[PDB]
Amino acid sequence: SRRNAWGNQSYAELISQAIESAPEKRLTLAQIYEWMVRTVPYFKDKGDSNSSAGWKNSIRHNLSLHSKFIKVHNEATGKSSWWMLNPEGG
């Protein structure tokens, strides 16, 4: 309701852009976080503060909710599961 500024875009859309931006089309959980700061500098100010741990959890709900994302079995012995968009469309 009070969304504005860069755009009332949903986080699912911003996460899709990051994966779509990558060539292999694959990113780990930590990469989404770093990419958001890169694709959304407005978060650089919070990086110097603990408040960073807040918005990061919100993203975690999107990864679990909306099967839009598929889980990948990391060969690194499940060190960091890779997130990918479903190939049925996108």
For 84, the 3-state DSSP assignment is: strand
* Cα separations in angstroms, 2 against 13, 22, 50: 18, 31, 24
**CA 67 to chain centroid:** 14
Other beta carbons less than 10 A from residue 32's beta carbon: 21
Sheet hosting strand 69-72, strand order edge to edge? 27-28, 82-85, 69-72
Could you tell me which CATH number the domain at 1-90 has? 1.10.10.10
Other beta carbons less than 10 A from residue 49's beta carbon: 9
DSSP letter, residue 6:
T
Distance between CA atoms of 24 and 44, rounded to whole angstroms?
Answer: 27
Experimental approach taken: NMR
- Domain map (residue ranges) of the chain: 1-90
